[PDB]
Design a protein around this nucleic acid. Structure first.
Ligand SMILES: [Mg+2]
Ligand SMILES: [Mg+2]
Ligand SMILES: [Mg+2]
Ligand SMILES: [Mg+2]
Ligand SMILES: [Zn+2]
Lengths: 52, 386, 225, 136
RNA sequence: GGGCGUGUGGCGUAGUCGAGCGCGCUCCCUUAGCAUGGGAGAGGUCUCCGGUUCGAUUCCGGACUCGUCCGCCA
RNA sequence: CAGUCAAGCGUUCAUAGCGACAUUGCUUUUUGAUUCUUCGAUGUCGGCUCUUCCUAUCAUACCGAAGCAGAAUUCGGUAAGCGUUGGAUUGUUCACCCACUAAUAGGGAACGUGAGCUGGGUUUAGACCGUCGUGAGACAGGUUAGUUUUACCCUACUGAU
RNA sequence: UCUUAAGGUAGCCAAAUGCCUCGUCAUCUAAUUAGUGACGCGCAUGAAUGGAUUAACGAGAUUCCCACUGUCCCUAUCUAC
């Protein structure tokens, strides 16, 4: 156990992201398009897979 | 089609072309980086390779299985008489690189250094630097204007030095002359050091000291024209091979329709200039001293010269550098010993080394004895001894 | 205690260490836990010497030790001999042995009073053992095992022998040594018990894989409680 | 060697390539060991994997007891007979090639070793040093 | 390597989605032999595993196994 | 060899990993198709040896994702800098086992490489068997024996004036 | 019973003769498309087209073992021309 607030603060940077389906890039959670050129700024995004 | 089995490339492409060196004295392509805080000192030295021997020392490596245990190692000996400073030169820096602008010589030049400026010394009027010494013996007029010119300009100061070949058992009589960089103080302090040290000798312990990692620059031993099997280490062809088997079978494909530069071929082997780095100094010996070969544990008064002398070289009556391992070049060759270009910690470059015993048996055979007193004590009296 | 210890992963402590009543010897290339076991259990009363015998980390199989004396092979250097002479107390005698079998821990199984040796040792070496150690000597094999030092662990209180040993050999050796002997295993069933562990009057040190019934057999036969 | 090594080993001059037959020094009933592999050996075109003293090899019993023949088992080289240099610079060699049988963890299948063993092998394998009579 | 088919009791073999016979032998009776015959026996995870069905040997998918057929160069 | 779509699988959950029914491509290490060049001749198998190149990356470097707790593993990115083995059988390429290893990745260079080798195979003339044929003879059916020529020229390359 | 007269007998075999085929089992080896011993619905064995066996012999073809070695690991050196 870390602490509940400290787990929230660490998960803000480590777990509450989104993943581009084409190029696996770690993206902002409210993003609409990937920031990478190689996937062509696609809008195929998924949430980052949580535990539990 | 593709090669059926992978294998590493034979030989090193960075040591190309494998041609004869331009001179018998290898060039120092780089000097240690200067900083203007240390006192004025040379960056390198010249000596003559004499030969190899063994030592026994107690190894100090905290963690090795041979910690605090005796090991026997091969060292090589470089005979180093004190070098004579004749001349300095300054280099300005241009957008096309470094460029010398003046050279100021010493006044009295010895015969062994002024033999370098001749191909037929025995039939000559010996007129060399005569009008230059006539430029000297005024008060200062044609001299410190060039010296103040080197002070005003010339971001790099190098000193022209020459060996004392007559102090060695070599039969050459013609000294070797070289430029050695100074790496201390300002430009004015460098040229003041050079001006004070004109016509003077510099000893090897003024530049080197024990447990120092240095570089050896020398031209390797020559071997003439050599086939590809020993020149490059390629695999010998099988026994039933028509038209010979010390060859390379395929020297290239159909396309590109040329022999490539990367294909191993026959030619000159050896006599290339090489720079070998990271050699530790074990002993800076003094020639004005008996018991050079003695240590604190052996303590028998014997010089570093073996029984019967060094094979093909002779005696070590001058100062010497005992350095660990093998250096390029054969015996009787000029070799330039250079300070390290970087600071190496490594827990091996910082090891303090104290020798226990130095081998002085004969290298002209299976020598049994270190000293003639020991040989006489073991064998008793002979017929020739009455 | 039979103390669980490893030599950097090795569960054979008798190979890398030699323990007597008066002194202890440990290899120079040892871990902090391995040194800390002997330092904590032995205390400051008994000297622990970090030593190398004949340039080898193995010291228990190279040397045979007693409270009165220590025996070292011929290949032991003068620096190691002088270091042992300085580090050891004045009571013990250190003497080089010039003998072909040359691995004295394997050859000799000994305690304070009585010793078992390899049958084929030389008579000068037997007299040297009887002189330096002050110990009466028998030439015997443990059920056909000539390496009595490797295949027996011996102390004053009792002894552990090889597991595959004939019972008749057990009472014969017990009557010959005047101590009770138990056939047993050490280090999860390893046969080499003397190489497996070291023991003295109040301490036994064994490998970590030595199981609880084996450790109980050790403390029972050596009376360490 | 590899897994069951107790420490490292300095380079010993390799004397036993693949196909070498050495004597079987222990009392396991095997007479000779035939080397088919060396643990930890590198890869070079046409180069035979060779063994030195103290190395662990893969071997088959060519001559011996039938329950030991016709299978591969690990072995440890204890006598080399090709001269090698130590760091104190003596060149030494035995008069025969000899090894013992072991598991992959290194403990001996047999119980006693006949003849000498090398100290570079006895330091590296403790079970060999345990069952060894004389260590040189 | 691929294609195509295949698989049932201890053995052989029949089955439309609603596991049976023979043989071997389990027993008993039968008999002047050159020893038979009669009556009741047991026996399957339908190759296996899923799905559909209400239930699949029976339908289907996958895997396994065996039999076939066709295949390299100069 | 790679896309796109997403019915399904994946306990639950299209897309962690997958993915039917479709459909768009790339490649020229497959095999065909064609017949352009060469029949006053470009030496047609495989192996050995040796250099270089490609990346559609097996390992090593640094990373992103997971049905990533650790350990082990899988998917993907920049990456060809660096390496990619020893053997039994077979003339083999291929294959299949034994074993080591960080790993035992795929390919090109006139299906690289015979005035570099070898000649086991194929592919002359001798000979045997089986099948076919009345026969002479035939058989990508099997077997055994069977001459591997020349550089001193130009260029290229390696060294030397 | 046909075909066409008679239908392969004694022996032998994945044989120099077996496509499938690197047939199946055993043995030989760490591993064997090789060898040997068996098996036989044998594409397409077989009896003076001679069948089977066979001591001795063979610059015949093939497999294994001992000895031996630069064939090889992995190359080095010397002499003459
Ligand atoms: Mg090729
Ligand atoms: Mg390749
Ligand atoms: Mg000599
Ligand atoms: Mg090869
Ligand atoms: Zn993206």
């Amino acid at each position: 156990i870390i602490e509940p607030s400290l787990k929230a603060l660490a998960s803000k940077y480590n777990c509450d992201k989104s993943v581009c389906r084409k190029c696996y890039a770690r993206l902002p959670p409210r993003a609409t398009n990937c920031r990478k050129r190689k996937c062509g700024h696609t809008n195929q995004l998924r949430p980052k897979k949580k535990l539990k | 089609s593709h090669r059926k089995y992978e294998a590493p490339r034979h030989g090193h492409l960075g040591f190309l072309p494998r041609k004869r060196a331009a001179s018998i004295r290898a060039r120092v392509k780089a000097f240690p980086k200067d900083d203007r805080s240390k006192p004025v000192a040379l960056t390198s030295f010249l000596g003559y390779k004499a030969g190899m021997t063994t030592i026994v020392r107690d190894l100090d490596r905290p963690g090795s299985k041979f910690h605090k245990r005796e090991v026997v190692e091969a060292v090589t000996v470089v005979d180093t008489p004190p070098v004579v400073v004749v001349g300095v030169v300054g280099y300005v820096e241009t957008p096309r690189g470094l460029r010398s602008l003046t050279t100021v010589w010493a006044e009295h030049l010895s015969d062994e250094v002024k033999r370098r400026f001749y191909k037929n010394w025995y039939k000559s009027k010996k007129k060399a630097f005569t009008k230059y010494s006539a430029k000297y013996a005024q008060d200062g007029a044609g001299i410190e204007r060039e010296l103040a010119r080197i002070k005003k300009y010339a971001s790099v100061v190098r000193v022209l030095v020459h060996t004392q070949i007559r102090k060695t058992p070599l039969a050459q009589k013609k000294a070797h002359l070289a430029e050695i960089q100074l790496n201390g103080g300002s430009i004015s302090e460098k040229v003041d050091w050079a001006r004070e040290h004109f016509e003077k000798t510099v000893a090897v312990d003024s530049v080197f000291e024990q447990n120092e990692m240095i570089d050896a620059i020398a031209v390797t031993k020559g071997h003439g024209f050599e086939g590809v099997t020993h020149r490059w280490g390629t695999k010998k062809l099988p026994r039933k091979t028509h038209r010979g088997l010390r060859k390379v079978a395929c020297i290239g494909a159909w396309h590109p329709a040329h022999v490539m530069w990367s294909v191993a071929r026959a030619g000159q082997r050896g006599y290339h200039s090489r720079t070998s780095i990271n050699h530790k100094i074990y002993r800076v010996g003094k020639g004005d001293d008996e018991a050079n070969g003695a240590t604190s544990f052996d303590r028998t008064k014997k010089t570093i010269t073996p029984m019967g002398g060094f094979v093909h070289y002779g005696e070590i009556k001058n100062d010497f550098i005992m350095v660990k391992g093998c250096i390029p070049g054969n015996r009787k060759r000029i070799v330039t010993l250079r300070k390290s270009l970087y600071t190496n910690t490594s827990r091996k470059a910082l090891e303090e080394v104290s020798l226990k015993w130095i081998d002085t048996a004969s290298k002209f055979g299976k020598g049994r004895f270190q000293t003639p007193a020991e040989k006489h004590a073991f064998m008793g009296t002979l017929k020739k001894d009455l | 205690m039979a103390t669980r210890t490893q030599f950097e992963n090795s569960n054979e402590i008798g190979v890398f260490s030699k323990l007597t009543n008066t002194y202890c010897l440990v290899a120079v290339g040892g871990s902090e836990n391995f040194y800390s076991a002997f330092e904590a259990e032995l205390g400051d009363a008994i000297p622990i010497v970090h030593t190398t015998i004949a340039g080898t980390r193995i010291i228990g199989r190279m040397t045979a030790g007693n409270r009165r004396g220590l025996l070292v092979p011929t290949q032991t250097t003068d620096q190691e001999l002088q270091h042992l002479r300085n580090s050891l107390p004045d009571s013990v005698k250190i003497q080089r042995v010039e003998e072909r079998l040359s691995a004295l821990g394997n050859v000799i199984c000994c305690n304070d009073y009585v010793a078992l040796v390899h049958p084929d040792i030389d008579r000068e070496t037997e007299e040297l053992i009887s002189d330096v150690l002050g110990v009466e000597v028998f030439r015997q094999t443990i059920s056909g095992n000539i390496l009595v030092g490797s295949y027996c662990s011996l102390s004053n209180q009792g002894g552990l022998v090889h597991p595959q040993t004939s019972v008749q050999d057990q009472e014969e050796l017990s009557s010959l040594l005047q101590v009770p002997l138990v056939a047993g295993t050490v280090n999860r069933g390893s046969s080499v018990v003397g190489a497996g562990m070291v023991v003295n009057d109040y301490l036994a040190v064994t490998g970590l894989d030595t199981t609880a019934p084996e450790l109980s057999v050790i403390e029972s036969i050596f009376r360490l409680q | 060697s590899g897994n069951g090594a107790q420490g490292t080993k300095f380079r010993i001059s390799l004397g036993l390539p693949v196909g070498a037959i050495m004597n079987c020094a222990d009392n396991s009933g095997a007479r000779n060991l035939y080397i088919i592999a060396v643990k930890g050996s590198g890869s070079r075109l046409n180069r035979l994997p060779a063994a030195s003293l103290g190395d662990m090899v893969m071997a088959t019993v060519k001559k011996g007891k039938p329950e030991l023949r016709k299978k591969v088992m690990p072995a440890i080289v204890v006598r080399q007979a090709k001269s090698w240099r130590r760091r104190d610079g003596v060149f030494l060699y035995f008069e025969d090639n000899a090894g013992v049988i072991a598991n992959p963890k290194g403990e001996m299948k047999g119980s006693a070793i006949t003849g000498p063993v090398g100290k570079e092998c006895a330091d590296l394998w403790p079970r060999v040093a345990s069952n060894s009579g004389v260590v040189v």
